[PDB]
């Protein structure tokens, strides 16, 4: 398939070069795979989701995304126009309130919920998790990301929007999950994007156009906008049968666009997420 006039982030994961605006992908599009979005919630009634999105857990008075952050990220994973895996199943886990904040224990409880709830869902192509959140370092927020990875779910986490080493931030500093940086349309590291030897891949994170609450759309920047690119890509890659949850982050970094990004600090990986699709 080929989506014309797609967002630049989608075309860039199907392009060996920047400056294009066409997204190419196998027509499978993550049919049979599942991606949990552990954020502020997903507006499941958005027409862009085509009834493929639904809220499975909340830790507050409502599972409604009164923020819009989780709705944007879910639209980048698998919506029809702004999504990578346009046929996946989207599950919402609201661990952050409508201000985008939440207690570490609420986040830890959400990661444990996904490692069990995947046995309540039908995902014959595997389970993906996108954690577009983060705070300071915590060995207990790290160990729970590793538990979610060990259960059988690919865990993709934002590197952080601090312009620093992601070693002082969780769960970005967990070595078994997949730490994702951000880039812009000119193949440069986002001025806010974190770096370090813990990063495993870079995704489109600057000026990302996706769904928004109220049935609307908007463009926002952040490493939390490049994680759903990799989370959706893996669901796409697992549906084709190229890789598994445990080896997705190693496969994505093996088929990536090597050495194309500028302003990558020394010792940080220069790899851009690439779907390797040949039409």
Q: Report d(CA 5, CA 81) in Å as an integer.
A: 10
| CA separation for the pair 7, 14 (Å, rounded) | 12
3 state DSSP class of 226: helix
- 3-state SS of 96-118 is CCCCCCCCHHHHHHHHHHHHHHH
Structural contact between residues 144 and 91, judged by C-beta atoms closer than 8 angstroms:
no
Q: How far apart are CA 76 and CA 72, in angstroms?
A: 6
User: Which residues touch 187 (CB under 8 Å, ≥6 apart)?
Assistant: 18, 260, 261, 262, 272
- Please, which experimental method was used? electron diffraction
Residue 96 lies in a domain: yes
Residue 200 annotated as part of some ligand binding site: yes
Q: What is the DSSP letter of 63?
A: -
In a domain, 206, yes or no: yes
Sheet holding 271-272, edge to edge: 53-58, 89-94, 34-39, 127-131, 153-158, 178-183, 199-204, 271-272, 257-258
Domain count of the fold of the chain? 1
Name the residue with tokens 């639209």.
Answer: 75
Query: CA 118 to CA 35: how far, in whole Å?
Result: 10
Residue at 279 is within a domain: no
| Residue 175 is assigned to a ligand binding site | yes
Q: Are β-strands 2-4 and 89-94 bridged in parallel, bridged antiparallel, or unpaired?
A: unpaired
* Spatial distance between the Cα atoms of 74 and 4, rounded to a whole number of angstroms: 21
User: Which residues span the domain enclosing 224?
Assistant: 2-272
Q: Give domain status of residue 278, yes or no.
A: no
Burial of 78 (0-12, 13-18, 19+ CB in 10 A): buried
At 229, list the tokens: 């690119």
204 assigned to some structural domain: yes
- Catalytic residue list: 39, 69, 224
Alpha helix stretches (DSSP H) within 30-182: 69-78, 104-117, 139-151
Query: String of b and e for 10-48 (b: at least 16 CB within 10 Å)?
Result: bbbbbbeebeeeebbbbebbbbbbbbbbbbbbbbbebeb
Tokens of 36: 């949990």
**Annotated binding-site residue? 260:** yes
Residue 277 lies in a domain: no
Nearest C-alpha neighbor of 153 from the set 145, 162, 161: 145
What CATH code is carried by the domain that includes residue 191? 3.40.50.200
């Amino acid at each position: 398939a080929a989506q014309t006039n797609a967002p630049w982030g989608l075309a860039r994961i199907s392009s060996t070069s920047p400056g294009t605006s066409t997204y190419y992908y196998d027509e499978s599009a993550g049919q049979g795979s599942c991606v949990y979005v552990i954020d502020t919630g997903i507006e499941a009634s958005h027409p862009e989701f085509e009834g493929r999105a639904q809220m499975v857990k909340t830790y507050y008075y409502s599972s409604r995304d009164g923020n819009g952050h989780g709705t944007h990220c879910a639209g980048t994973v698998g919506s029809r126009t702004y999504g990578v895996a346009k046929k996946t199943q989207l599950f919402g886990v609201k661990v952050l309130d409508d201000n985008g904040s939440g207690q570490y224990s609420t986040i830890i409880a959400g990661m444990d919920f996904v490692a069990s709830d995947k046995n309540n869902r039908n995902c014959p192509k595997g389970v993906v998790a996108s954690l577009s959140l983060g705070g300071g370092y915590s060995s207990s927020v790290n160990s729970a990301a590793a538990r979610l990875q060990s259960s059988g779910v690919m865990v993709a986490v934002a590197a952080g929007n601090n312009n620093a080493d992601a070693r002082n931030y969780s769960p970005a500093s967990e070595p078994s999950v997949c730490t994702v940086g951000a880039s812009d349309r000119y193949d440069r590291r986002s001025s806010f994007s974190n770096y370090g030897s813990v990063l495993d891949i870079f995704g489109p994170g600057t000026s990302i156009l996706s769904t928004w609450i109220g049935g609307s759309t908007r463009s926002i920047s952040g490493t939390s906008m490049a994680t759903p690119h990799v989370a959706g890509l893996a669901a796409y890659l697992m549906t084709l049968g190229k890789t598994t949850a445990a080896s997705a982050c190693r496969y994505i970094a093996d088929t990536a666009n090597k050495g194309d990004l500028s302003n990558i600090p020394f010792g940080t990986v220069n790899l851009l997420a690439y779907n390797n699709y040949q039409a």
